[PDB]
Amino acid sequence: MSSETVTLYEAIGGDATVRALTRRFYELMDTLPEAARCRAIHPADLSGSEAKFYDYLTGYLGGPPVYVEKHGHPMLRRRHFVAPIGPAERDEWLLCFRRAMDETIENAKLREIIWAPVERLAFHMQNQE
Numbered sequence: 689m690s691s692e693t694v695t696l697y698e699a700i701g702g703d704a705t706v707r708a709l710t711r712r713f714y715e716l717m718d719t720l721p722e723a724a725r726c727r728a729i730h731p732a733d734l735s736g737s738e739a740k741f742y743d744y745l746t747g748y749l750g751g752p753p754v755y756v757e758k759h760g761h762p763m764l765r766r767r768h769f770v771a772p773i774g775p776a777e778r779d780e781w782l783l784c785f786r787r788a789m790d791e792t793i794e795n796a797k798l799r800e801i802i803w804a805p806v807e808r809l810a811f812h813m814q815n816q817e
């Protein structure tokens with residue numbers, strides 16, 4: 689929606705915010721020693737991962753459906769099956785996503801709206817242990 693209601697994308701500040709969110713996420717993943725397990729299973733060059741997550745989040749939050757346009761149906765559990773994701777990879781991903789959100793999305797109510805379903809998805813991507 690845009691006029692009396694608005695989308696989450698609109699609400700958090702749209703493209704500049706999703707850009708900052710996704711950038712800060714991979715930065716924390718690359719620089720925090722506590723995120724080393726999650727970092728270990730990602731590609732040595734994070735550039736392509738960032739592009740895809742940014743496109744995924746853009747569509748997911750009510751912005752333009754750019755991820756689907758390029759890659760088709762998300763099918764995330766299947767796409768994540770190629771990485772070995774145990775509790776550690778899972779909680780370290782959630783560590784970085786939480787901190788990236790807290791730092792880039794000012795509105796607490798919008799962070800709560802986004803977080804609960806993402807944390808559900810993360811537990812659902814876990815494929816080990």
Ligand code: HEM
Nearest residue numbers: 729730736737740741744767771777778781809810813814
């Ligand atoms: C358990 C937590 C998670 C871990 C450890 C994890 C890890 C990974 C890894 C290793 C990749 C492959 C990177 C690449 O191809 O460059 C990936 C891709 C991706 N992840 Fe996750 N992920 C997790 C949860 C999530 C969640 C909850 C979402 C959605 C909010 C998500 C969205 C994506 C997307 C859109 C891709 C690109 C898929 C594609 O290849 O088209 N991930 N993730």
